[PDB]
Amino acid sequence: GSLLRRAEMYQDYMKQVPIPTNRGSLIPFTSWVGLSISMKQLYGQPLHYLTNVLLQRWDQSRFGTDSEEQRLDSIIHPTKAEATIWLVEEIHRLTPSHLHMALLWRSDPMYHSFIDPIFPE
Question: Which domains are assigned to the chain?
Answer without folding.
Answer: 1-121 (1.20.120.690)
